[PDB]
Write a protein that binds this ligand. Structure first.
Ligand SMILES: Cc1nnc(CNc2nc(Cl)cnc2N)n1C1CC1
Length: 167
């Protein structure tokens, strides 16, 4: 039993809710919140911008030190950093950004990072300002992630479409 509330069950291990991931993280304080990161960990907008703002920019400060030491992430890759006031840990995962021309096949590699964590609160990777079809992202999630994932979808209209079209 865990503390996630109000989710619709899609599969054995994938759950979905219309929610603001920031507000959901603040209430649940999950072990892991996933950030929709880019390779530079520049958290300017979308989910990343929202999460970083909620940490009062502490996420960005930590991220800048990470990059200065380690260099950029790979598209499809990830790193574990602090969850600050939102979670124990933040798993920064880089899905391909279609608006930069990155290969959508890398979306499966991106979701594979979730399998290193037993339970996660997450957005749909490569959705929103990353330009991919969220219906496709949900399908890849369900077909790739085997650990327990709680998906937060900000947009109510999109949430309803994802549920109604789910096979
Ligand atoms: C549309 C849409 N609906 N949900 C998402 C991603 N998930 C979340 N993003 C935020 Cl900013 C807050 N809370 C979330 N759960 N998107 C993408 C970024 C454009």
């Amino acid at each position: 039993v865990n503390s996630f509330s109000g989710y619709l069950k899609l599969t054995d291990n994938v759950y979905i809710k219309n929610a603001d991931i920031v507000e959901e993280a603040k209430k649940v304080k999950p072990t892991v919140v996933v950030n929709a990161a880019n390779v530079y960990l520049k958290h300017g907008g979308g989910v990343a911008g929202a999460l970083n703002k909620a940490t009062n920019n502490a996420m960005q400060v930590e991220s800048d030190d990470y990059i200065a030491t380690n260099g950029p992430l790979k598209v499809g890759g990830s790193c574990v950093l602090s969850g600050h006031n939102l979670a124990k840990h933040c798993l920064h995962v880089v899905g391909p950004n279609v608006n930069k021309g990155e290969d959508i096949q890398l979306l499966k590699s991106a979701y594979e990072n979730f399998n290193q964590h037993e339970v996660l609160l997450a957005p749909l990777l490569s959705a929103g300002i990353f330009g991919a079809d969220p219906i496709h992202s949900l399908r890849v999630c369900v077909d790739t992630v085997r650990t327990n994932v709680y998906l937060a979808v900000f947009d109510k209209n999109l949430y309803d479409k994802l549920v109604s079209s789910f096979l």
